[PDB]
Design a protein around this motif. Sequence first.
Motif, PDB file in Angstrom:
ATOM      1  N   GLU A   1       0.840  -1.189   0.000  1.00  0.00           N
ATOM      2  CA  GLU A   1       0.000   0.000   0.000  1.00  0.00           C
ATOM      3  C   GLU A   1       0.882   1.249   0.000  1.00  0.00           C
ATOM      4  O   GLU A   1       0.538   2.273  -0.585  1.00  0.00           O
ATOM      5  CB  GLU A   1      -0.944  -0.019   1.214  1.00  0.00           C
ATOM      6  N   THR A   2       2.036   1.134   0.643  1.00  0.00           N
ATOM      7  CA  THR A   2       2.992   2.226   0.714  1.00  0.00           C
ATOM      8  C   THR A   2       3.874   2.283  -0.546  1.00  0.00           C
ATOM      9  O   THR A   2       4.407   3.338  -0.903  1.00  0.00           O
ATOM     10  CB  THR A   2       3.882   2.075   1.967  1.00  0.00           C
ATOM     11  N   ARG A   3       4.044   1.143  -1.208  1.00  0.00           N
ATOM     12  CA  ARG A   3       4.881   1.069  -2.403  1.00  0.00           C
ATOM     13  C   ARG A   3       4.084   1.304  -3.692  1.00  0.00           C
ATOM     14  O   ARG A   3       4.631   1.778  -4.690  1.00  0.00           O
ATOM     15  CB  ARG A   3       5.564  -0.300  -2.473  1.00  0.00           C
ATOM     16  N   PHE A   4       2.811   0.949  -3.679  1.00  0.00           N
ATOM     17  CA  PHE A   4       1.951   1.095  -4.840  1.00  0.00           C
ATOM     18  C   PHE A   4       1.361   2.494  -4.909  1.00  0.00           C
ATOM     19  O   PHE A   4       0.357   2.796  -4.270  1.00  0.00           O
ATOM     20  CB  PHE A   4       0.828   0.055  -4.808  1.00  0.00           C
ATOM     21  N   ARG A   5       2.001   3.340  -5.698  1.00  0.00           N
ATOM     22  CA  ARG A   5       1.564   4.723  -5.873  1.00  0.00           C
ATOM     23  C   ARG A   5       0.290   4.808  -6.714  1.00  0.00           C
ATOM     24  O   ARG A   5      -0.267   5.888  -6.907  1.00  0.00           O
ATOM     25  CB  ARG A   5       2.671   5.548  -6.529  1.00  0.00           C
ATOM     26  N   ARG A   6      -0.169   3.667  -7.206  1.00  0.00           N
ATOM     27  CA  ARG A   6      -1.377   3.612  -8.014  1.00  0.00           C
ATOM     28  C   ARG A   6      -2.281   2.497  -7.513  1.00  0.00           C
ATOM     29  O   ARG A   6      -2.190   1.357  -7.963  1.00  0.00           O
ATOM     30  CB  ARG A   6      -1.033   3.402  -9.488  1.00  0.00           C
ATOM     31  N   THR A   7      -3.125   2.828  -6.550  1.00  0.00           N
ATOM     32  CA  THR A   7      -4.023   1.853  -5.956  1.00  0.00           C
ATOM     33  C   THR A   7      -5.486   2.250  -6.138  1.00  0.00           C
ATOM     34  O   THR A   7      -6.272   1.524  -6.741  1.00  0.00           O
ATOM     35  CB  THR A   7      -3.727   1.709  -4.454  1.00  0.00           C
ATOM     36  N   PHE A   8      -5.847   3.403  -5.584  1.00  0.00           N
ATOM     37  CA  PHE A   8      -7.223   3.895  -5.645  1.00  0.00           C
ATOM     38  C   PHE A   8      -7.552   4.548  -6.990  1.00  0.00           C
ATOM     39  O   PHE A   8      -8.667   5.021  -7.204  1.00  0.00           O
ATOM     40  CB  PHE A   8      -7.467   4.889  -4.504  1.00  0.00           C
ATOM     41  N   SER A   9      -6.589   4.574  -7.895  1.00  0.00           N
ATOM     42  CA  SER A   9      -6.798   5.171  -9.206  1.00  0.00           C
ATOM     43  C   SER A   9      -7.675   4.285 -10.072  1.00  0.00           C
ATOM     44  O   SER A   9      -8.693   4.725 -10.613  1.00  0.00           O
ATOM     45  CB  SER A   9      -5.445   5.387  -9.883  1.00  0.00           C
ATOM     46  N   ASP A  10      -7.265   3.038 -10.202  1.00  0.00           N
ATOM     47  CA  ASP A  10      -7.973   2.060 -11.009  1.00  0.00           C
ATOM     48  C   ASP A  10      -9.331   1.749 -10.414  1.00  0.00           C
ATOM     49  O   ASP A  10     -10.259   1.353 -11.120  1.00  0.00           O
ATOM     50  CB  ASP A  10      -7.128   0.796 -11.136  1.00  0.00           C
ATOM     51  N   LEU A  11      -9.445   1.968  -9.119  1.00  0.00           N
ATOM     52  CA  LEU A  11     -10.697   1.757  -8.412  1.00  0.00           C
ATOM     53  C   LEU A  11     -11.742   2.717  -8.964  1.00  0.00           C
ATOM     54  O   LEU A  11     -12.877   2.339  -9.251  1.00  0.00           O
ATOM     55  CB  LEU A  11     -10.510   2.017  -6.918  1.00  0.00           C
ATOM     56  N   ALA A  12     -11.322   3.965  -9.137  1.00  0.00           N
ATOM     57  CA  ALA A  12     -12.188   4.997  -9.674  1.00  0.00           C
ATOM     58  C   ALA A  12     -12.346   4.811 -11.169  1.00  0.00           C
ATOM     59  O   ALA A  12     -13.446   4.927 -11.706  1.00  0.00           O
ATOM     60  CB  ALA A  12     -11.626   6.377  -9.365  1.00  0.00           C
ATOM     61  N   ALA A  13     -11.232   4.511 -11.829  1.00  0.00           N
ATOM     62  CA  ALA A  13     -11.219   4.290 -13.270  1.00  0.00           C
ATOM     63  C   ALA A  13     -12.280   3.270 -13.682  1.00  0.00           C
ATOM     64  O   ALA A  13     -13.002   3.470 -14.656  1.00  0.00           O
ATOM     65  CB  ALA A  13      -9.840   3.832 -13.709  1.00  0.00           C
ATOM     66  N   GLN A  14     -12.371   2.184 -12.926  1.00  0.00           N
ATOM     67  CA  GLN A  14     -13.348   1.136 -13.206  1.00  0.00           C
ATOM     68  C   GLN A  14     -14.775   1.606 -12.935  1.00  0.00           C
ATOM     69  O   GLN A  14     -15.663   1.450 -13.773  1.00  0.00           O
ATOM     70  CB  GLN A  14     -13.068  -0.096 -12.351  1.00  0.00           C
ATOM     71  N   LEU A  15     -14.997   2.158 -11.747  1.00  0.00           N
ATOM     72  CA  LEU A  15     -16.327   2.615 -11.353  1.00  0.00           C
ATOM     73  C   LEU A  15     -16.606   4.043 -11.823  1.00  0.00           C
ATOM     74  O   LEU A  15     -17.488   4.726 -11.289  1.00  0.00           O
ATOM     75  CB  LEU A  15     -16.488   2.507  -9.834  1.00  0.00           C
ATOM     76  N   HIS A  16     -15.852   4.488 -12.818  1.00  0.00           N
ATOM     77  CA  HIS A  16     -16.005   5.828 -13.366  1.00  0.00           C
ATOM     78  C   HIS A  16     -17.197   5.892 -14.307  1.00  0.00           C
ATOM     79  O   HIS A  16     -17.948   6.866 -14.314  1.00  0.00           O
ATOM     80  CB  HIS A  16     -14.740   6.237 -14.122  1.00  0.00           C
ATOM     81  N   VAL A  17     -17.353   4.855 -15.110  1.00  0.00           N
ATOM     82  CA  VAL A  17     -18.444   4.793 -16.070  1.00  0.00           C
ATOM     83  C   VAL A  17     -19.683   4.117 -15.472  1.00  0.00           C
ATOM     84  O   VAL A  17     -20.747   4.732 -15.389  1.00  0.00           O
ATOM     85  CB  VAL A  17     -18.007   4.077 -17.379  1.00  0.00           C
ATOM     86  N   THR A  18     -19.546   2.857 -15.068  1.00  0.00           N
ATOM     87  CA  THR A  18     -20.658   2.104 -14.502  1.00  0.00           C
ATOM     88  C   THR A  18     -20.168   0.753 -13.961  1.00  0.00           C
ATOM     89  O   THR A  18     -19.242   0.155 -14.518  1.00  0.00           O
ATOM     90  CB  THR A  18     -21.773   1.916 -15.574  1.00  0.00           C
ATOM     91  N   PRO A  19     -20.775   0.265 -12.861  1.00  0.00           N
ATOM     92  CA  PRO A  19     -20.401  -1.009 -12.240  1.00  0.00           C
ATOM     93  C   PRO A  19     -20.963  -2.219 -12.993  1.00  0.00           C
ATOM     94  O   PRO A  19     -21.300  -2.130 -14.174  1.00  0.00           O
ATOM     95  CB  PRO A  19     -21.029  -0.908 -10.851  1.00  0.00           C
ATOM     96  N   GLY A  20     -21.067  -3.349 -12.300  1.00  0.00           N
ATOM     97  CA  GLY A  20     -21.592  -4.552 -12.919  1.00  0.00           C
ATOM     98  C   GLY A  20     -20.552  -5.280 -13.743  1.00  0.00           C
ATOM     99  O   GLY A  20     -20.078  -6.350 -13.354  1.00  0.00           O
ATOM    100  N   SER A  21     -20.188  -4.697 -14.877  1.00  0.00           N
ATOM    101  CA  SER A  21     -19.192  -5.281 -15.768  1.00  0.00           C
ATOM    102  C   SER A  21     -17.776  -5.070 -15.226  1.00  0.00           C
ATOM    103  O   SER A  21     -16.881  -4.598 -15.928  1.00  0.00           O
ATOM    104  CB  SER A  21     -19.331  -4.675 -17.165  1.00  0.00           C
ATOM    105  N   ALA A  22     -17.585  -5.429 -13.967  1.00  0.00           N
ATOM    106  CA  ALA A  22     -16.296  -5.294 -13.321  1.00  0.00           C
ATOM    107  C   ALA A  22     -15.595  -6.642 -13.236  1.00  0.00           C
ATOM    108  O   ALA A  22     -14.377  -6.706 -13.072  1.00  0.00           O
ATOM    109  CB  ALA A  22     -16.461  -4.689 -11.935  1.00  0.00           C
TER     110      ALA A  22
END
Length: 188
Positions: free
Chosen positions: A59-80
């Motif tokens: 979590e401390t080494r991964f500077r990109r964690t919550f980004s993809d979280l938003a990226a995925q749920l940016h358009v619409t859920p379900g097809s995750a």
Amino acid sequence: GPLGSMATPASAPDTRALVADFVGYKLRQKGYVCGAGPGEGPAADPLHQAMRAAGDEFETRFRRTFSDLAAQLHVTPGSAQQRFTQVSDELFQGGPNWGRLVAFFVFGAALCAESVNKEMEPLVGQVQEWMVEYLETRLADWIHSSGGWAEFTALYGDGALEEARRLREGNWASVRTVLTGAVALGAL
């Protein structure tokens, strides 16, 4: 007594308990705090303390964690599930080492957290099952033959000797970078 002799212990400290632990603890700490229960227990099991130290370090080494979280749920859920399964397969392509094992659980645990913070309540359980199923079906095999969850608990647990630590570092170097192209969750 009322019960006891007619009551057997439910939910053993298996993968289901471990997946509910890491994800529960994380979600309960940043999202599902109202739903106190999954993350009600800390690092005490022969895998719990292992994952807890893993996620923390990554979590401390991964500077990109919550980004993809938003990226995925940016358009619409379900097809995750398709997005998750894609990166999961790329992660299991050839190197499900303890170095990557962190990102394995961290991916869903972080995903689930932000899902409870948004309109993705049912999606949380899905990511949970997608993770535990992918793991129980293929990850567990690698883990069992490698050294077991117990090995991981020794790697970064109580007996986290300097050799075990550098081992994980040298490990992820060749494994996390070889499957570093699994950024299929990076959408807009």
